[PDB]
Design a protein around this motif. Structure first.
Motif, PDB file in Angstrom:
ATOM      1  N   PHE A 186      11.438 -11.646   0.983  1.00 29.61           N
ATOM      2  CA  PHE A 186      11.014 -10.722   2.030  1.00 29.61           C
ATOM      3  C   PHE A 186      11.098  -9.253   1.594  1.00 29.61           C
ATOM      4  O   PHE A 186      10.166  -8.468   1.817  1.00 29.61           O
ATOM      5  CB  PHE A 186      11.880 -10.943   3.279  1.00 29.61           C
ATOM      6  CG  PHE A 186      11.295 -10.369   4.533  1.00 29.61           C
ATOM      7  CD1 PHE A 186      10.117 -10.897   5.065  1.00 29.61           C
ATOM      8  CD2 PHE A 186      11.927  -9.324   5.196  1.00 29.61           C
ATOM      9  CE1 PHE A 186       9.586 -10.390   6.232  1.00 29.61           C
ATOM     10  CE2 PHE A 186      11.397  -8.798   6.372  1.00 29.61           C
ATOM     11  CZ  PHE A 186      10.223  -9.327   6.892  1.00 29.61           C
ATOM     12  N   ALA A 187      12.221  -8.896   0.978  1.00 29.37           N
ATOM     13  CA  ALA A 187      12.464  -7.537   0.511  1.00 29.37           C
ATOM     14  C   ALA A 187      11.558  -7.200  -0.673  1.00 29.37           C
ATOM     15  O   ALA A 187      11.060  -6.083  -0.784  1.00 29.37           O
ATOM     16  CB  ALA A 187      13.949  -7.344   0.129  1.00 29.37           C
ATOM     17  N   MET A 188      11.360  -8.163  -1.560  1.00 25.91           N
ATOM     18  CA  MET A 188      10.467  -7.971  -2.700  1.00 25.91           C
ATOM     19  C   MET A 188       9.023  -7.750  -2.226  1.00 25.91           C
ATOM     20  O   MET A 188       8.313  -6.890  -2.749  1.00 25.91           O
ATOM     21  CB  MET A 188      10.566  -9.154  -3.664  1.00 25.91           C
ATOM     22  CG  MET A 188       9.811  -8.958  -4.975  1.00 25.91           C
ATOM     23  SD  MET A 188       8.083  -9.412  -4.794  1.00 25.91           S
ATOM     24  CE  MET A 188       8.215 -11.202  -4.923  1.00 25.91           C
ATOM     25  N   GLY A 189       8.608  -8.513  -1.218  1.00 29.76           N
ATOM     26  CA  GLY A 189       7.308  -8.324  -0.599  1.00 29.76           C
ATOM     27  C   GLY A 189       7.120  -6.911  -0.087  1.00 29.76           C
ATOM     28  O   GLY A 189       6.032  -6.323  -0.232  1.00 29.76           O
ATOM     29  N   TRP A 190       8.179  -6.358   0.511  1.00 29.32           N
ATOM     30  CA  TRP A 190       8.117  -5.012   1.063  1.00 29.32           C
ATOM     31  C   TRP A 190       8.036  -3.953  -0.042  1.00 29.32           C
ATOM     32  O   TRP A 190       7.211  -3.027   0.060  1.00 29.32           O
ATOM     33  CB  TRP A 190       9.283  -4.759   2.011  1.00 29.32           C
ATOM     34  CG  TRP A 190       9.366  -3.356   2.545  1.00 29.32           C
ATOM     35  CD1 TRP A 190      10.140  -2.341   2.057  1.00 29.32           C
ATOM     36  CD2 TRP A 190       8.670  -2.825   3.678  1.00 29.32           C
ATOM     37  NE1 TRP A 190       9.963  -1.212   2.814  1.00 29.32           N
ATOM     38  CE2 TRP A 190       9.072  -1.482   3.820  1.00 29.32           C
ATOM     39  CE3 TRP A 190       7.750  -3.357   4.595  1.00 29.32           C
ATOM     40  CZ2 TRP A 190       8.584  -0.652   4.839  1.00 29.32           C
ATOM     41  CZ3 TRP A 190       7.256  -2.534   5.607  1.00 29.32           C
ATOM     42  CH2 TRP A 190       7.673  -1.194   5.714  1.00 29.32           C
ATOM     43  N   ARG A 191       8.880  -4.088  -1.075  1.00 28.21           N
ATOM     44  CA  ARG A 191       8.819  -3.244  -2.292  1.00 28.21           C
ATOM     45  C   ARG A 191       7.433  -3.253  -2.914  1.00 28.21           C
ATOM     46  O   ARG A 191       6.920  -2.216  -3.344  1.00 28.21           O
ATOM     47  CB  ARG A 191       9.777  -3.752  -3.380  1.00 28.21           C
ATOM     48  CG  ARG A 191      11.226  -3.490  -3.143  1.00 28.21           C
ATOM     49  CD  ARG A 191      12.003  -3.593  -4.442  1.00 28.21           C
ATOM     50  NE  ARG A 191      12.080  -4.950  -4.988  1.00 28.21           N
ATOM     51  CZ  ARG A 191      12.839  -5.926  -4.497  1.00 28.21           C
ATOM     52  NH1 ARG A 191      13.574  -5.732  -3.400  1.00 28.21           N
ATOM     53  NH2 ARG A 191      12.860  -7.113  -5.098  1.00 28.21           N
ATOM     54  N   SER A 192       6.849  -4.443  -2.984  1.00 25.53           N
ATOM     55  CA  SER A 192       5.526  -4.623  -3.557  1.00 25.53           C
ATOM     56  C   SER A 192       4.475  -3.879  -2.741  1.00 25.53           C
ATOM     57  O   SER A 192       3.597  -3.211  -3.305  1.00 25.53           O
ATOM     58  CB  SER A 192       5.200  -6.112  -3.679  1.00 25.53           C
ATOM     59  OG  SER A 192       6.067  -6.724  -4.628  1.00 25.53           O
ATOM     60  N   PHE A 193       4.591  -3.976  -1.419  1.00 26.27           N
ATOM     61  CA  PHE A 193       3.716  -3.271  -0.497  1.00 26.27           C
ATOM     62  C   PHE A 193       3.882  -1.750  -0.628  1.00 26.27           C
ATOM     63  O   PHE A 193       2.901  -1.039  -0.843  1.00 26.27           O
ATOM     64  CB  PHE A 193       3.952  -3.763   0.942  1.00 26.27           C
ATOM     65  CG  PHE A 193       3.332  -2.895   2.008  1.00 26.27           C
ATOM     66  CD1 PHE A 193       1.943  -2.742   2.094  1.00 26.27           C
ATOM     67  CD2 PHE A 193       4.138  -2.250   2.943  1.00 26.27           C
ATOM     68  CE1 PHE A 193       1.374  -1.936   3.076  1.00 26.27           C
ATOM     69  CE2 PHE A 193       3.582  -1.445   3.935  1.00 26.27           C
ATOM     70  CZ  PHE A 193       2.188  -1.295   4.007  1.00 26.27           C
ATOM     71  N   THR A 194       5.117  -1.263  -0.542  1.00 30.79           N
ATOM     72  CA  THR A 194       5.360   0.178  -0.540  1.00 30.79           C
ATOM     73  C   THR A 194       5.071   0.863  -1.877  1.00 30.79           C
ATOM     74  O   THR A 194       4.644   2.011  -1.887  1.00 30.79           O
ATOM     75  CB  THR A 194       6.785   0.544  -0.059  1.00 30.79           C
ATOM     76  OG1 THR A 194       7.763  -0.045  -0.927  1.00 30.79           O
ATOM     77  CG2 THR A 194       7.009   0.050   1.362  1.00 30.79           C
ATOM     78  N   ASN A 195       5.269   0.153  -2.989  1.00 30.52           N
ATOM     79  CA  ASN A 195       5.137   0.747  -4.326  1.00 30.52           C
ATOM     80  C   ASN A 195       3.789   0.552  -4.985  1.00 30.52           C
ATOM     81  O   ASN A 195       3.290   1.453  -5.649  1.00 30.52           O
ATOM     82  CB  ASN A 195       6.227   0.232  -5.275  1.00 30.52           C
ATOM     83  CG  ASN A 195       7.623   0.491  -4.751  1.00 30.52           C
ATOM     84  OD1 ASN A 195       7.820   1.327  -3.877  1.00 30.52           O
ATOM     85  ND2 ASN A 195       8.598  -0.239  -5.273  1.00 30.52           N
TER      86      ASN A 195
END
Ligand SMILES: Cc1c(N[C@@H]2CCC[C@@]2(C)O)ccc(C#N)c1Cl
Lengths: 10, 244
Positions: B77-86
């Motif tokens: 979930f957190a990796m998905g968010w990092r991937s989205f934001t970065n």
């Protein structure tokens, strides 16, 4: 008990 | 807004994989770096979880259990968010020093799983998830997987999970509009679970054959994968879905 060790260490 | 102050305060910063980007993208090197990262993330998940509102009210054995069970989903979930934001979900941003392109996705033999994770990441864009919604959802994910015959103190767990659901509701409300949003977010949360299950299956299979494919597992990882993950895969521990 590696995880337990970490849990109590932090 | 005390609750949201806390969630922002305890959110982990940047975690590096320790990956030597100069070595060729082999299966063994990629997965050995992924495993090192996994362990570093687990350390952060422990410190994060223990600082969550109400978490210390749980029986201590239940505290250790929910962290171990939810770890994979929390990481995804957190990796998905990092991937989205970065990188606007165009690649998998596991860490600053370990960004998966299509070649690495193939070489890690995790391609189909990576595709599913990239789709989850894209959801954050499609649903326009806010940082506050992301934080509350992630906290709820910790309380979304339990043993079928229950925790040591299930009643305290049920109360806490209820309070985390209420907090998500308040974040949305900050009537048909709220209702639609809550439906979208619970559906997104449910969708983490099948992805986490696939990663659990992949990780377990990999551990078993790890000596044969020269993939290194840190000791604590190898413990959790061999002791806790099979409880999930054998159906002794299951996700709590919103939608049946
Ligand atoms: C899905 C995942 C990992 N999975 C690898 C794949 C094989 C075993 C494993 C758990 O080490 C590892 C680190 C992060 C991070 N950050 C994430 Cl999101």
């Amino acid at each position: 008990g590696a995880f337990q060790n970490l849990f109590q260490s932090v | 807004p005390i609750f949201l102050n806390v969630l922002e305060a305890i959110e982990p910063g940047v975690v590096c994989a320790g990956h030597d980007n100069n070595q060729p993208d082999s299966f063994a090197a990629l997965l050995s770096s992924l495993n090192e990262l996994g362990e570093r993330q687990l350390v952060h998940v422990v410190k994060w979880a223990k600082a969550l509102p109400g978490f210390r009210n749980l029986h201590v054995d239940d505290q250790m259990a929910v962290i171990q069970y939810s770890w994979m989903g929390l990481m995804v979930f957190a990796m998905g968010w990092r991937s989205f934001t970065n990188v606007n979900s165009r690649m998998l941003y596991f860490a600053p020093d370990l960004v998966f392109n299509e070649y690495r996705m193939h070489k890690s033999r995790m391609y189909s799983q990576c595709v599913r994770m990239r789709h989850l990441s894209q959801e954050f864009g499609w649903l326009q998830i806010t940082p506050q919604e992301f934080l509350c959802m992630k906290a709820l994910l910790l309380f979304s997987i339990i043993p079928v015959d229950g925790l040591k103190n299930q009643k305290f767990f049920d109360e806490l999970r209820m309070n985390y659901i209420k907090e998500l509701d308040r974040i949305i409300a900050c009537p048909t509009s709220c209702s639609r949003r809550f439906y979208q977010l619970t559906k997104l949360l449910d969708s983490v679970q099948p992805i986490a299950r696939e990663l659990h299956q992949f990780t377990f299979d990999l551990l078993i054959k790890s000596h044969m494919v020269s993939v290194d597992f840190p000791e604590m990882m190898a413990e959790i994968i061999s002791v806790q993950v099979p409880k999930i895969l054998s159906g002794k521990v299951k996700p709590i879905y919103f939608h049946t």
